[PDB]
Amino acid sequence: EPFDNSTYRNLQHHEYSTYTFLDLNVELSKFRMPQPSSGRQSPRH
Amino acid sequence: GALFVHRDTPENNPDTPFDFTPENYKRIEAIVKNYPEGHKAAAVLPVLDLAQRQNGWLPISAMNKVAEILQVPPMRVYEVATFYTMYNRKPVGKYHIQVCTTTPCMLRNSDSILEAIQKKLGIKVGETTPDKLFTLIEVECLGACVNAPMVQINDNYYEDLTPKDIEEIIDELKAGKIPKPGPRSGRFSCEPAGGLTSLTEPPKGPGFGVQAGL
Amino acid sequence: PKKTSFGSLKDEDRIFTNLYGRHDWRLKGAQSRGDWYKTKEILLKGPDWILGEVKTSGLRGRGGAGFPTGLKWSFMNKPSDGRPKYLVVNADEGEPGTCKDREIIRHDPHKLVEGCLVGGRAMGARAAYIYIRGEFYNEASNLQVAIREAYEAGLIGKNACGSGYDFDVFVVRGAGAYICGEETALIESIEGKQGKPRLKPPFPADVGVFGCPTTVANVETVAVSPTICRRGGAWFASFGRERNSGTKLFNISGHVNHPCTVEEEMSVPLKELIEKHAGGVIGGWDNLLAVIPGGSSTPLIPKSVCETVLMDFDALVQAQTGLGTAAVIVMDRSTDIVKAIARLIEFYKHESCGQCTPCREGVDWMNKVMARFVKGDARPAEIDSLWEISKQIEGHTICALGDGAAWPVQGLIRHFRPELEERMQQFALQHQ
Amino acid sequence: SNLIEVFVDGQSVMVEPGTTVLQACEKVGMQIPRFCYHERLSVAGNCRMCLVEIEKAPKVVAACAMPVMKGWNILTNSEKSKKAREGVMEFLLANHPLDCPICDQGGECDLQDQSMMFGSDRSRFLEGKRAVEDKNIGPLVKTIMTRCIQCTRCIRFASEIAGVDDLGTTGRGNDMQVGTYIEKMFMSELSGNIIDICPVGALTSKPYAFTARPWETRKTESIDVMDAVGSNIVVSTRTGEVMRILPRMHEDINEEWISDKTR
Amino acid sequence: SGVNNTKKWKMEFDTRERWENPLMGWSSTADPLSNLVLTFSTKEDAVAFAEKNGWSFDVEERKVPKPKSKSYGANFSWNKRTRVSTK
Ligand SMILES: Cc1cc2nc3c(=O)[nH]c(=O)nc-3n(C[C@H](O)[C@H](O)[C@H](O)COP(=O)(O)O)c2cc1C
Numbered sequence A: 001e002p003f004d005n006s007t008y009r010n011l012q013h014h015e016y017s018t019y020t021f022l023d024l025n026v027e028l029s030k031f032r033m034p035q036p037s038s039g040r041q042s043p044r045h
Numbered sequence B: 001g002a003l004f005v006h007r008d009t010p011e012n013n014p015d016t017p018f019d020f021t022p023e024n025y026k027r028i029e030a031i032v033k034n035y036p037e038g039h040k041a042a043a044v045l046p047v048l049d050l051a052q053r054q055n056g057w058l059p060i061s062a063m064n065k066v067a068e069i070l071q072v073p074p075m076r077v078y079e080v081a082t083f084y085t086m087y088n089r090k091p092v093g094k095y096h097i098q099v100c101t102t103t104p105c106m107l108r109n110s111d112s113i114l115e116a117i118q119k120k121l122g123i124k125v126g127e128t129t130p131d132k133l134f135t136l137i138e139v140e141c142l143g144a145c146v147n148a149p150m151v152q153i154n155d156n157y158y159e160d161l162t163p164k165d166i167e168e169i170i171d172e173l174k175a176g177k178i179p180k181p182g183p184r185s186g187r188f189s190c191e192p193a194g195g196l197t198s199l200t201e202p203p204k205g206p207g208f209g210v211q212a213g214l
Numbered sequence C: 001p002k003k004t005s006f007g008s009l010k011d012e013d014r015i016f017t018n019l020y021g022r023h024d025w026r027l028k029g030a031q032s033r034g035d036w037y038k039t040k041e042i043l044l045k046g047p048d049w050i051l052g053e054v055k056t057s058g059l060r061g062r063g064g065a066g067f068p069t070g071l072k073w074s075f076m077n078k079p080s081d082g083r084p085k086y087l088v089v090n091a092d093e094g095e096p097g098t099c100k101d102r103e104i105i106r107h108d109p110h111k112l113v114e115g116c117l118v119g120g121r122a123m124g125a126r127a128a129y130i131y132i133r134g135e136f137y138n139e140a141s142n143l144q145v146a147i148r149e150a151y152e153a154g155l156i157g158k159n160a161c162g163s164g165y166d167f168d169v170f171v172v173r174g175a176g177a178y179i180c181g182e183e184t185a186l187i188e189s190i191e192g193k194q195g196k197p198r199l200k201p202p203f204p205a206d207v208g209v210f211g212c213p214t215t216v217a218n219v220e221t222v223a224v225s226p227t228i229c230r231r232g233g234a235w236f237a238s239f240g241r242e243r244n245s246g247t248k249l250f251n252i253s254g255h256v257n258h259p260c261t262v263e264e265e266m267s268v269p270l271k272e273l274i275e276k277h278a279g280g281v282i283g284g285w286d287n288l289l290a291v292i293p294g295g296s297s298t299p300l301i302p303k304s305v306c307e308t309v310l311m312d313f314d315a316l317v318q319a320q321t322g323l324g325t326a327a328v329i330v331m332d333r334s335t336d337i338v339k340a341i342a343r344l345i346e347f348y349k350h351e352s353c354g355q356c357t358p359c360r361e362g363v364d365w366m367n368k369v370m371a372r373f374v375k376g377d378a379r380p381a382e383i384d385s386l387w388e389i390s391k392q393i394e395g396h397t398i399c400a401l402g403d404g405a406a407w408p409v410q411g412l413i414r415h416f417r418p419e420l421e422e423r424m425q426q427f428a429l430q431h432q
Numbered sequence D: 001s002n003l004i005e006v007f008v009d010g011q012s013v014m015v016e017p018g019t020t021v022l023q024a025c026e027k028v029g030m031q032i033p034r035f036c037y038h039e040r041l042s043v044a045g046n047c048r049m050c051l052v053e054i055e056k057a058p059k060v061v062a063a064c065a066m067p068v069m070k071g072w073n074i075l076t077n078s079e080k081s082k083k084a085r086e087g088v089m090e091f092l093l094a095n096h097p098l099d100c101p102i103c104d105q106g107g108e109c110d111l112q113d114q115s116m117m118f119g120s121d122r123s124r125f126l127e128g129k130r131a132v133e134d135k136n137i138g139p140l141v142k143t144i145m146t147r148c149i150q151c152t153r154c155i156r157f158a159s160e161i162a163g164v165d166d167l168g169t170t171g172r173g174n175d176m177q178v179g180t181y182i183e184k185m186f187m188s189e190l191s192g193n194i195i196d197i198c199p200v201g202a203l204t205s206k207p208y209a210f211t212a213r214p215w216e217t218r219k220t221e222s223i224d225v226m227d228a229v230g231s232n233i234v235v236s237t238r239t240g241e242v243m244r245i246l247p248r249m250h251e252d253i254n255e256e257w258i259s260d261k262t263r
Numbered sequence E: 001s002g003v004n005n006t007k008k009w010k011m012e013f014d015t016r017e018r019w020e021n022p023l024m025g026w027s028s029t030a031d032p033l034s035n036l037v038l039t040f041s042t043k044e045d046a047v048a049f050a051e052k053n054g055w056s057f058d059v060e061e062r063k064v065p066k067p068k069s070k071s072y073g074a075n076f077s078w079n080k081r082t083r084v085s086t087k
């Protein structure tokens, strides 16, 4: 809680699953703005 | 490994079964929603990173399958897999040992840990263990290249490592339990062995500068 | 009017007050150390307001660039052509010994996103495709949970910080490439292709990811930009020498008693850099044969030169080196300098996209000719040839990887040449 | 009108806005040494042989990807540019296998001709060389991938003109193998032109392989008849028989490419 | 890719019989005007050479290349097909 210059305070690093990146990606869908309308469905389109 | 021309293997073939979990399709949808529509070819990088979490490596059945779902030509994802280093196209062990021997690590004798791990495991650099559990190979530096010479297991790293406790890194890994990920030495975050030479006073809070309206 | 004592950086001088992950990396400790205080007001004042602040500051490119940040950002502040303006963060950190990118993300990831948010107001960035190296899966997660706290608090996202700004920052993990650390290579690394550097000139100013304006800024420059908007250009410019000012993560390592990453003032003498913050160099200065002060792309310099050279960009230039990323590492006398960079030069070969001919054929050829150098199977002329082709690839590669690989070997030749000529007849006498 | 004025080693030349140096010095009759740029094929700027230094410019500029502006008097024959051409070439030359007597490009090789004009006279390479596994992508073109210069001219021609993606460049580092990874075959109806595109003997005609040498062929001009396009062709004959059908230049009808059937 | 052969004109003739000789395979020929290509600066002097010795001509205009307007930035686009994904 204090400055405690002899601490790491990153135990959450140890508590990270193998799917962690994509798991936060899945739950990051609510507060999203609209990806810009490039027009063509694909760069090839 | 060390190959850039595909040989159709009996087990790693285009016919190799390879699919995604119901939550995994959500992860891909979460992957593609970050990048704009009509430019979904950018999503090829993290989905390929996602690809080897399922099988354990990059099967060639995955590369063309992920090409068809991402509506990209097969050769484009073919290049993404072969270029990046951790994108391994050959099956690898459960513990992908990533020993660091880049100059800053070798200066602090990163050879000692490599020899120590070589002696116990018997298998040489690159090849898998006889139980295919660990895979020792020399690569470039992890990107954290300041502590004592460091190693990286799949997605779980270790730095501030000595030839004595590299023995103590694989022992419990062989047993199954996970060792402590991070600096083995007294560096909780990065602090020098002589304590900490900065950040003595408590950090300040808000209300500083406030130039005009700020 | 002049702070000649530009060493022993003070605690307030440390922009990242949670640099060692002391209080809390996440939102809970972010407000404790001063994050998210009047960020909206910084955005509300105006894009030119922070443009003036960075101009009166003049942040040198800490990612081995040296370009003042005020002009680089101002090249982009204009009414949008139509292509969505984006912000790009380069957190590859493939440089040997460089750790500045990591000491920001895992110990105050909000500090980086402060610089993206306050910068993005100047840039006009409605989004930021911030990138993180593939070897930092642990640390992309830490800023992903941190990005959530700011996303749901209104600070970033929908009308970011309560002022009209649909600014959303997106994180992309890498998959391993030191060449990806360049802006022109990371830009199509994000775009979903082989991470090769882009030819010039187009610019990030007009094109970029999917052909969009993209401000690539080093995390250290990004995350220091808060303090220069919260205090002003007087704070940044007061520390450090002319042009070279502010504070940078000096990553002391190599043959040092206590190798660590410390925020440190620049224009600092090398001796007290390793003495105060690390207890000295192993074996003292006499054992110290040379130092790589700036990083890989910064040539090493001899003991007769180190003494108290100041790590300000101008002073490294006269020292025939650069600031790089202040990833300072030391080799003792026991360490063979020919062997010391032997892994360094082959590291460059292992990390090269290989598109342009000078780099693809250069470092590997340099690797083989130096392999017989460290072994000694060469003639005295061979060092001169190594000189010639090193300058040959200099300024002839599409990107700065070749030039970044040129400086280490280039510096060694003109600095420890007699030692290079020493090892070869040592080979000749016994392998005769 | 909007056109801007530059010079090329003296003489003033009028140029279009956005003009590159390659299409700037050709107006006076200069071919900057190139190995990765084709006129009707997208810019690459990878071979680095187009490099030319101008006065008042400390660093040499990639000519094929350099938008010229006012007051750019390109110093074509400047010594630094001459040094740049020499070093870049010998860097291509380094890992090239010594197959000139056994490569069909001998006598019509871009690497050979350039190395005789903008080239040195002896090698400083004292190390081992590099070798690549040969591929096989159809019984109509021979792929000696060891002789490749990684100009990426093949991958662009396939992706932009042929409309296929069976070609790519795999690897990281010096290796940078160019091929298909998984074995495949060039199914393009315009696949034959990739033989003409490759500047080296990496891609060569299988039927013609070791049947004649360029300096004995009495070229003649005719047209395609397989297609109604009437593609302009160059018929290479020797001592009273036809060896190869080469595509002529006509731009608006066939450019410089012909169908695989007529090749 | 070199061009330094398209800069001049010639006086090429048409082909005649190329028959295989009875022996090892010489392509014996009976027309002397076979390997007599000329080299000319322009085309008006080319024809001027043609009728002085009374040879029927068949001229052809030089195929000067069409303009080669290219843009490196065009390879990296937003909604333009010229967005290139291969280098
Ligand atoms: C080989 C190479 C690697 C680089 N790696 C990094 C890196 O890891 N992080 C970074 O911030 N900049 C890196 N850079 C610098 C970038 O290319 C770019 O100049 C910089 O990020 C721009 O922002 P800055 O001016 O704030 O440094 C690298 C450059 C080169 C040539």
Ligand code: SF4
Binding pocket: C179, C197, C351, C352, C353, C354, C355, C356, C357, C358, C359, C360, C397, C398, C399, C400, C401, C402, C403
């Ligand atoms: S120097 Fe050239 S070949 Fe090497 S990584 Fe950079 S762009 Fe690629």
Ligand code: SF4
Binding pocket: D096, D097, D098, D099, D100, D101, D102, D103, D104, D105, D106, D107, D109, D110, D111, D112, D147, D199, D200, D201, D202
């Ligand atoms: S491609 Fe050219 S240089 Fe290479 S072997 Fe053939 S003729 Fe010789």
Ligand code: SF4
Binding pocket: D147, D148, D149, D150, D151, D152, D153, D154, D155, D178, D197, D198, D199, D200, D202, D203
């Ligand atoms: S195979 Fe030929 S066209 Fe393709 S990259 Fe190599 S030299 Fe260029």
Ligand code: FES
Binding pocket: D033, D034, D035, D036, D037, D044, D045, D046, D047, D048, D049, D050, D051, D062, D063, D064, D065
């Ligand atoms: S043509 Fe300019 S680099 Fe290949």
Ligand SMILES: [K+]
Binding pocket: D105, D194, D195, D196, D197, D198, D199, D200, D201, D202, D203, D204
């Ligand atoms: K060819």
